[PDB]
Write a protein that binds this ligand. Structure first.
Ligand SMILES: [Mg+2]
Ligand SMILES: [Mg+2]
Ligand SMILES: [Mg+2]
Ligand SMILES: [Mg+2]
Ligand SMILES: [Mg+2]
Ligand SMILES: [Mg+2]
Ligand SMILES: [Mg+2]
Ligand SMILES: [Mg+2]
Ligand SMILES: [Mg+2]
Ligand SMILES: [Mg+2]
Ligand SMILES: [Mg+2]
Ligand SMILES: [Mg+2]
Ligand SMILES: [Mg+2]
Ligand SMILES: [Mg+2]
Ligand SMILES: [Mg+2]
Ligand SMILES: [Mg+2]
Ligand SMILES: [Mg+2]
Ligand SMILES: [Mg+2]
Ligand SMILES: [Mg+2]
Ligand SMILES: [Mg+2]
Ligand SMILES: [Mg+2]
Ligand SMILES: [Mg+2]
Ligand SMILES: [Mg+2]
Ligand SMILES: [Mg+2]
Ligand SMILES: [Mg+2]
Ligand SMILES: [Mg+2]
Ligand SMILES: [Mg+2]
Ligand SMILES: [Mg+2]
Ligand SMILES: [Mg+2]
Ligand SMILES: [Mg+2]
Ligand SMILES: [Mg+2]
Ligand SMILES: [Mg+2]
Ligand SMILES: [Mg+2]
Ligand SMILES: [Mg+2]
Ligand SMILES: [Mg+2]
Ligand SMILES: [Mg+2]
Ligand SMILES: [Mg+2]
Ligand SMILES: [Mg+2]
Ligand SMILES: [Mg+2]
Ligand SMILES: [Mg+2]
Ligand SMILES: [Mg+2]
Ligand SMILES: [Mg+2]
Ligand SMILES: [Mg+2]
Ligand SMILES: [Mg+2]
Ligand SMILES: [Mg+2]
Ligand SMILES: [Mg+2]
Ligand SMILES: [Mg+2]
Ligand SMILES: [Mg+2]
Ligand SMILES: [Mg+2]
Ligand SMILES: [Mg+2]
Ligand SMILES: [Mg+2]
Ligand SMILES: [Mg+2]
Ligand SMILES: [Mg+2]
Ligand SMILES: [Mg+2]
Ligand SMILES: [Mg+2]
Ligand SMILES: [Mg+2]
Ligand SMILES: [Mg+2]
Ligand SMILES: [Mg+2]
Ligand SMILES: [Mg+2]
Ligand SMILES: [Mg+2]
Ligand SMILES: [Mg+2]
Ligand SMILES: [Mg+2]
Ligand SMILES: [Mg+2]
Ligand SMILES: [Mg+2]
Ligand SMILES: [Mg+2]
Ligand SMILES: [Mg+2]
Ligand SMILES: [Mg+2]
Ligand SMILES: [Mg+2]
Ligand SMILES: [Mg+2]
Ligand SMILES: [Mg+2]
Ligand SMILES: [Mg+2]
Ligand SMILES: [Mg+2]
Ligand SMILES: [Mg+2]
Ligand SMILES: [Mg+2]
Ligand SMILES: [Mg+2]
Ligand SMILES: [Mg+2]
Ligand SMILES: [Mg+2]
Ligand SMILES: [Mg+2]
Ligand SMILES: [Mg+2]
Length: 244
RNA sequence: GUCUCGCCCGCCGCGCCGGGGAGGUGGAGCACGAGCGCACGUGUUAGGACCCGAAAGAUGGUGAACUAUGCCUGGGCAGGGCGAAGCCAGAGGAAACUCUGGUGGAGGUCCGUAGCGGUCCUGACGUGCAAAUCGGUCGUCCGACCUGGGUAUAGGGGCGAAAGACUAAUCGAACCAUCUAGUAGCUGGUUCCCUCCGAAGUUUCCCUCAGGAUAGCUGGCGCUCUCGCACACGCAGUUUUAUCCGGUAAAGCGAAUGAUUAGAGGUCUUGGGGCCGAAACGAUCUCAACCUAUUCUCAAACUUUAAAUGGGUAAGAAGCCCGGCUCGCUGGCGUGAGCCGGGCGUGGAAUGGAGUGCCUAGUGGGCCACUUUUGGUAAGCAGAACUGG
RNA sequence: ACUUUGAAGGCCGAAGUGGAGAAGGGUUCCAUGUGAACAGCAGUUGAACAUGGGUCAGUCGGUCCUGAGAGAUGGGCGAGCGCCGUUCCGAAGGGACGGGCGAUGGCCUCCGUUGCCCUCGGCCGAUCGAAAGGGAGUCGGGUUCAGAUCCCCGAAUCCGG
RNA sequence: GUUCUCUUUUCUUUGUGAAGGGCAGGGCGCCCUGGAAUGGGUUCGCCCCGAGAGAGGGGCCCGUGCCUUGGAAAGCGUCGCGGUUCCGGCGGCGUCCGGUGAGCUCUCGCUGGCCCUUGAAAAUCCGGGGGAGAGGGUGUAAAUCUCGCGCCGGGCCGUACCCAUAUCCGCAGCAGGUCUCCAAGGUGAACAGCCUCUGGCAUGUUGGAACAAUGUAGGUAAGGGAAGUCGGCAAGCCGGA
RNA sequence: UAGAACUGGUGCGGACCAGGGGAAUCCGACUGUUUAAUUAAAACAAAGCAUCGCGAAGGCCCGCGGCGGGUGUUGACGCGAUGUGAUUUCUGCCCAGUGCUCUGAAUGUCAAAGUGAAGAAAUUCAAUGAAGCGCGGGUAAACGGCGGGAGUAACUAUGACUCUCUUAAGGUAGCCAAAUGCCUCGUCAUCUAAUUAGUGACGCGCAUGAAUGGAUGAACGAGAUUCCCACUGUCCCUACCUACUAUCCAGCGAAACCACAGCCAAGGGAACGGGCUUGGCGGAAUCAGCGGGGAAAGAAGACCCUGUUGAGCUUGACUCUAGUCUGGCACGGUGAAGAGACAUGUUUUUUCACUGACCCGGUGAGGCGGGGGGGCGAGCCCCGAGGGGCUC
RNA sequence: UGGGGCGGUACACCUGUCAAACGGUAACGCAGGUGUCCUAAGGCGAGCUCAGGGAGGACAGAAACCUCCCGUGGAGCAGAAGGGCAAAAGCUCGCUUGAUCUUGAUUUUCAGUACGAAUACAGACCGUGAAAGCGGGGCCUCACGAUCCUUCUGACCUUUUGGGUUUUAAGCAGGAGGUGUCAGAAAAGUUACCACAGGGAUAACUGGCUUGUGGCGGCCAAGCGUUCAUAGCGACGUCGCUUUUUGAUCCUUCGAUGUCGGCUCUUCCUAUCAUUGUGAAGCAGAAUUCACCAAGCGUUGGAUUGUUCACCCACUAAUAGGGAACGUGAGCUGGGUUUAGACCGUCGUGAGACAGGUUAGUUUUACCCUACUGAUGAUGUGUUGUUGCCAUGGUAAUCCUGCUCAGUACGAGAGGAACCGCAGGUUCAGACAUUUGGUGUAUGUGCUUGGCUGAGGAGCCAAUGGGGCGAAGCUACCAUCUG
């Protein structure tokens, strides 16, 4: 046959990302003495729009504990913040919107964002537009804590992971329809080369296994085993249900 | 060498050494050696293999100056129509609000130039201006827009708003060189003369039916003999004299098997749309069949009978006769076969020189006519026997 | 008939059949002469043939910077020519400086200096990459068969020492 | 230039660079007094005001425009001289007043709208901040994020012409294709189409004679009006305000 | 810009510029894209709708190779993979078949290595026993599929009703002689002088039917069809005109093709001759045309057959393979509990904990653990109230 | 393989016939069979009689069982058919296991090779019979399979590698495990995106032979026709022609004969629709029906449909049938069919198929030879001219209406003709332009838009600026003349 689409994406060179106009990488500042034991202060300067994203980004400025210099960080913004706000980071912080502190000092039932998965990954989880995690249960024996994620899954992590307090800005976006095509075009043009999906049935059987026929039809069951090879692993993968 | 019955020998150490006869048998063997080397010719093969002839497969490499798509950075697009929110004023209303007149200038909106494209004329040209042009008529024209240059992706791979489309006039797998004189049961071609002999298209086997092997048909090279050499035997798409074989033509059914017509003597006899009647075998008919003697017609898969043409043997010296020997075979005594030694030549017609052995090519698609003959309405149709072309 | 000069009649109609340039071409440019060949007829003509001549910069462009991206070192992998990868498993800059120490040739005054002892040192990755992006500062007049923001005249200006 | 009749007529020509100094003119999200409703000011539109409007007086930026130095000597237009000529030659005049615009183009500013799009980086240069570090004596201090004036230099490579119905690619002087700048008069809504001036050309690889047939491109037709034909195919009607 | 008079042989957007309309059905919502050089379409795309996997030692994928690389300067309002196709109004039953998926020691089967008995030893035997296949559940906006006979209503005909045989269910709401109906030019109405056409109705539908999407319905279409008004040389029926040619002359000057050649009837023949046979007949060299023949030119017929010649594509053909699931040996170390088969200790094993090989992330490798010199303080003990012990 | 595919097996075997009297002999020729069955249905000996038919006998009947007579096979012998068999080869009883071990020869098919099957002998061991003798499978004709590999049986059997012993392995001889495509490969589809070497040894058009089917026509004559075989029809039967129907065949053509239908144009046939000249009726008149000579002149306008065919409207003397490579594509068109894209239904798991439907889709070349039409010229006559004759060839005129004859003849009536005459028309043909119309660049004369020659006048430019009237000429059943 011939190699198909999808099997061409994993090599890159035409399906790569478009990163000329992106401003940086969002991540929470590193761990150090002050943030481990005490706290530290910083100030917001401006709020900005990052392409390829829905969540706006803050700019925070800190005073370096060891040199006569200043140090800038590019956080992801909770909902409520503004310029001129003082932002306090670390263990001795007060529980209010915009600050950063650990999990095992928070109470139950509280909201967070830009959470960490392991202690010092600078922030990985719950960092999209309108989402938030939630604290559930502590365990001062063994230093563990459980967290609800926006997929509806309960997950265990430590009590030294850091996190940011509050929902994320951009909240409520998929409740606007797009109505046109060229609003989609300017969307994905800033992210990837991916938008027009040609249906497999309108192909020929060289370049897709569902292709061909005098009619348009699939001909075979659209579910497929997890361990099928590349080229055939298309459709409803490992489906344990179909319908609704 | 190999089975079957067997009685014996020699050896300083007797076995699980060695020897006879034959029912007999398996062998590319013996029996008074013929090869070895050199050259020439023909023939069958393996090699580029008489010459030219593919679609294709592998190894290694050049290409995105056309086109497909993504990114970087720069440029470009008359004049007009409809009139969304928002704003002002006047009038009405108890209020919420409403009516009328302006302003404003949004929109993958409308008409239309530049530009980008490419519907119809199924027009022109159709050895052209042109390996895809020209003319008028067309489509869209603030936007999923048009475009320059730079940069990324390379061949069972790339890119694709998908048509199996494009990838340097080439794409249902590019091009360049080599492997490579790839293979071909298949087409086309194969170079001077005279003489001589002179065919087949048929059998059996083959994943065989456009082809090969096998036998047959043909040629060449010989060799053993003999004759008008006063001096003979042997042969034959032939006739004759004797003698066997056959079941086809015709004929036959008052003879078997099978089929079939009609009336005379049988209610033979079952029963009657019924029959004169209580009906019966009292009668009286008959019918599907049915006893006796006769009658008309039939047979590729029936036959008592039985040709014409045909096939096979025989027509003498390898015969006849006389006498005697050998035999585990057979046995009243004897038969049979084999060996020995002697005596007796024309054995129906008409013809002519016979026999034997190696090498060996081309063929292996057939066709017609009398006569016989199968299928088919018939055929310049299809399939066979005889002879001749 | 076709060159040239004059006169007359006509077309292009400023999104041009006009005046200048990029890519590409490469002497085709300018004068004198020729009429074999070529210019699908002709030619006293020619972008043809022959012989000669012609492109002048502190200020116009390159050169400098980086862009998408390409690409060495260390390291890793690989039969092997080599390939991956660009801050990633690296003692990664010779960077400089104020002070002290003996020396230095010039009238060792002032120096740089080969040399150290000190002394502050991050950067964070060699290099390449656009004659349309970014990037100090020149204008008018005149002059040739053919050259001018370059030659001559006259008025200015940037950088460095 | 026209004048046979008219035409105070029609046509052409009628200027000052770079770099400075001064001033018009536009813009300000700049300051000082002062305290606003009977709410005011104000744009085509918007829009603004005790977080200080209107009204008064001030400051800053751009000032491609006018004046001035350049610079009238030079250039141009006319009427005349000399040099045989081999001449940037010599003279006499002039190089002037005003005005309108939904006018076209180029530019500078103000302001608003659209975006699940938010619209490059680096070389290089600059100012500020405690003064770190210090440095130097009444005539010194050397840097200097510098006042005016003589000085010295500024290397290498390209630069001719064509840029297209004849210098490029298409085998060719091929009706094809190939990125940009400048852009007048009239009609008209208009860079539509029709005629003209500046500048360019000789009809697009040849000419003369005559007007048969069939062609190709254009047109017109009495009366009827799709009866034609697979099919109103092609042509024709309507057409702007 | 609006109005009035007068004037012209009704001519007046006077040239150029410059929309034919109307009534209806089928498809696709629209704008957009598309087979360069025969197809611009009803085909692709879209917005909207719905499912599917995934919480990073991950999902999808690349790769000869590696602390390799893309999505990823990412984190479920996201990334990847699939089908339908705006809105409105709806989305019916079947888990028997096939696929997918969950668990599972409690059950057959099930390889290497390992365990044990016999043998002089190769060897043989036995017990053991992973994933997978079977055993069992869930799923149809997953591939897909969704029936026959007979009797029956006070005139006939129909047949609401009843019976019956089997299937995983036996076609629901809608719609139809359609771009889907063989029999077929189905039947009835209308349009027409006349209609195999077209519109509206009927429906035991060879073979319609529900995201393999059903039914509708404004605007748009270089889309496919029927009719009407105005219009016309499309036609009755052809004619006239103008330009460039063709034609003649001067000058320059090719090609394809070509056995030999070039008047007919009939006859026979490889059955349709320019040439043969029997008859007809036969007179130099040429000019403009036209298209009957030359079975006229081009391209070793793509239709059909054969070939023990090929290639593209698919799968339940045959033989294999990358990748991937799983068991075993090595890298593999420390300690502690529990329980075993033989036989009267052996190793085995399940579990818990450790770190030093190994792996991961972060950083300009910037303040780790104990300790009390700490002390601003607190609460717990002794407490000379002065001390030190504990929690911080 | 009477083209291939679907079907069948004529692909290994048996009987009868065809097959032409030895033997042998073909076709998808006729009729049928096989891939088995048997511890006896094999083998020896002995004894007996089959099918059926008749006559009798308690229940007893068409048929149970008993007895007698006739009985040439008319019954049986495993299966298909054929042959053969009576104190058997059949039925029944007794005993057994020649269905065993071993060489070689021959026959059948045939090359004169193999398998298989069969025959006659020889050596052994045996069985049955009193014994002669018979028996090494089934009364005869068919019932089955190589190398290589594996497994089993056998001999105090050879080798296992420098010698010896034991195990294993290899060898020798004989059975079995199997190839049905049966003298013996290990094996699924699709291509409309397709390709190559060849083929008229082989198909889809014409042509050619045949004429079943289709069409047309004769013979004899039972009945129809109230009566009356034959005015006109004609059963049951039978003899023929034609190639405008569809088949059968496969001779030419596969290095190419351009494949449906309409448009256009010419010629030919007759099996006569009408018109001319005539005959016959169940012909009073008028209309109609059968037939003869005859192919001269005619046979139309339209809705539907791609149409050939069909069907309806309207007029007409009439609305007849055919051909020529199923006339005619360097003459048109390209609607359909018959490439490439695509949509529905049915089938296939699927790529894909449909003899089902629907939409969009490149139609080349003449300047050669001939023929055909027109145009110059040529031979000879001494040269040249004027006037003329004729061979030979073509060939052209055709139909209808009206008034009169006449509301006459005829006929009961209703109704209803014709011959000569007069005037006019249709289709065709040949010229012509007095008059009407059309053309119009005489670029003739006015009018008018935009622009340009300073303006007026006179003029030009806009591939014929537009528009109005229009001479000569060319032209029309759209005007006229003639046959
Ligand atoms: Mg799609
Ligand atoms: Mg497709
Ligand atoms: Mg596939
Ligand atoms: Mg299906
Ligand atoms: Mg050879
Ligand atoms: Mg070759
Ligand atoms: Mg191969
Ligand atoms: Mg390139
Ligand atoms: Mg096209
Ligand atoms: Mg055309
Ligand atoms: Mg032509
Ligand atoms: Mg030309
Ligand atoms: Mg396709
Ligand atoms: Mg060769
Ligand atoms: Mg041959
Ligand atoms: Mg062959
Ligand atoms: Mg006979
Ligand atoms: Mg031979
Ligand atoms: Mg120029
Ligand atoms: Mg120019
Ligand atoms: Mg250039
Ligand atoms: Mg010339
Ligand atoms: Mg020149
Ligand atoms: Mg550089
Ligand atoms: Mg630049
Ligand atoms: Mg103020
Ligand atoms: Mg130049
Ligand atoms: Mg013009
Ligand atoms: Mg000329
Ligand atoms: Mg030219
Ligand atoms: Mg007319
Ligand atoms: Mg019509
Ligand atoms: Mg018609
Ligand atoms: Mg039209
Ligand atoms: Mg409908
Ligand atoms: Mg559409
Ligand atoms: Mg095309
Ligand atoms: Mg929807
Ligand atoms: Mg689905
Ligand atoms: Mg459903
Ligand atoms: Mg299931
Ligand atoms: Mg229904
Ligand atoms: Mg209908
Ligand atoms: Mg119609
Ligand atoms: Mg269905
Ligand atoms: Mg469907
Ligand atoms: Mg000519
Ligand atoms: Mg002839
Ligand atoms: Mg003939
Ligand atoms: Mg010929
Ligand atoms: Mg011809
Ligand atoms: Mg061929
Ligand atoms: Mg070929
Ligand atoms: Mg073969
Ligand atoms: Mg290939
Ligand atoms: Mg399989
Ligand atoms: Mg065959
Ligand atoms: Mg015979
Ligand atoms: Mg007996
Ligand atoms: Mg017997
Ligand atoms: Mg014996
Ligand atoms: Mg050994
Ligand atoms: Mg040994
Ligand atoms: Mg197809
Ligand atoms: Mg007949
Ligand atoms: Mg044929
Ligand atoms: Mg033939
Ligand atoms: Mg034949
Ligand atoms: Mg031809
Ligand atoms: Mg021809
Ligand atoms: Mg006749
Ligand atoms: Mg024809
Ligand atoms: Mg043609
Ligand atoms: Mg022709
Ligand atoms: Mg068509
Ligand atoms: Mg098609
Ligand atoms: Mg005559
Ligand atoms: Mg005028
Ligand atoms: Mg007129």
């Amino acid at each position: 046959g011939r190699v198909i689409r999808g099997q061409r994406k994993g090599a890159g060179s035409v399906f790569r990302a478009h990163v000329k106009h992106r401003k940086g990488a969002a991540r929470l500042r590193a761990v150090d003495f002050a943030e481990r034991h005490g706290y530290i202060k910083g100030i917001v300067k401006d709020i900005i729009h990052d392409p390829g994203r829905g969540a706006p980004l803050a700019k925070v400025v800190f005073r370096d504990p060891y040199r006569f210099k200043k140090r800038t960080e590019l956080f992801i913004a909770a909902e409520g913040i503004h310029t001129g706000q003082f932002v306090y980071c670390g263990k001795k912080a007060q529980l209010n919107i915009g600050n950063v502190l650990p999990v095992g000092t928070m109470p139950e039932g509280t909201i967070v964002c830009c959470l960490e998965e392991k202690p010092g990954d600078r922030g990985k989880l719950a960092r999209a537009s309108g989402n938030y995690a939630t604290v559930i249960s502590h365990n001062p024996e063994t230093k563990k804590t459980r967290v609800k994620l926006p997929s509806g899954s309960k997950k265990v992590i430590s009590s030294a992971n850091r996190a940011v307090v509050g929902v994320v800005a951009g909240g409520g976006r998929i409740d606007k329809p797009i109505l046109k095509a060229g609003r989609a075009y300017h969307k994905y043009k800033a992210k990837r080369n991916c938008w027009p999906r040609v249906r497999g049935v309108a192909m020929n059987p060289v370049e897709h296994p569902f292709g061909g026929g005098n009619h348009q039809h699939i001909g075979k069951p659209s579910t497929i085993r997890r361990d099928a090879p590349a080229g055939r692993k298309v459709g409803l993968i490992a489906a344990r249900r179909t319908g609704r």
